[PDB]
């Protein structure tokens, strides 16, 4: 009541592997500031001062 083993591997639908994982095709990035951005007394996002 069963078929042969050489045939059953041709029976199954071979799914398509894309090996490119689809990551950055929709990604809206944002530039990272290397230097720290702080607030002055007006509340404005300035660089961190060189006063240490």
């Amino acid at each position: 009541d069963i078929p042969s083993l050489d045939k059953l591997v041709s029976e199954i639908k071979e799914v398509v592997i894309e090996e490119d994982d689809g990551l950055e095709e929709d990604f809206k990035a944002e530039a990272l500031s290397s230097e720290t951005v702080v607030l002055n007394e007006e509340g404005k996002s300035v660089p961190l001062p060189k006063k240490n």
Partner: protein, 99 residues
């Protein structure tokens, strides 16, 4: 005796000297020309130690807000107390000083 009511001072704060310095040093007649440290978006370190800086001021800081010390080391404003901010430090507290 009525003077024994005022025998021991009943303090409702701990950093009281940091508040009375904000009103006694501008009473000096040379020192009304903006010789003042700001409190709204800036802060002064009161205490450092064990990676916990207690910061005077920072009146508009949010709970869990990232702060930066002037040494470059960053921190997180975790306790927002009535007169200071308890800031945990994201590095070594060796570079943070009082003031």
């Amino acid at each position: 005796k009525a003077l024994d009511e005022l025998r021991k001072p009943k303090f409702s704060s701990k950093y009281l000297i940091q508040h009375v310095s904000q009103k006694l040093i501008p009473a000096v007649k040379e020192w009304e020309k903006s010789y003042q440290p700001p409190v709204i978006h800036l802060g002064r370190v009161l205490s450092v130690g064990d990676g916990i800086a207690r910061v005077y001021g920072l009146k508009s800081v949010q709970a869990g807000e990232l702060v930066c010390f002037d040494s470059g080391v960053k921190g997180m404003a975790l306790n927002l107390q009535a007169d200071h901010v308890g800031v945990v430090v994201f590095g070594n507290d060796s570079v943070i000083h009082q003031g």
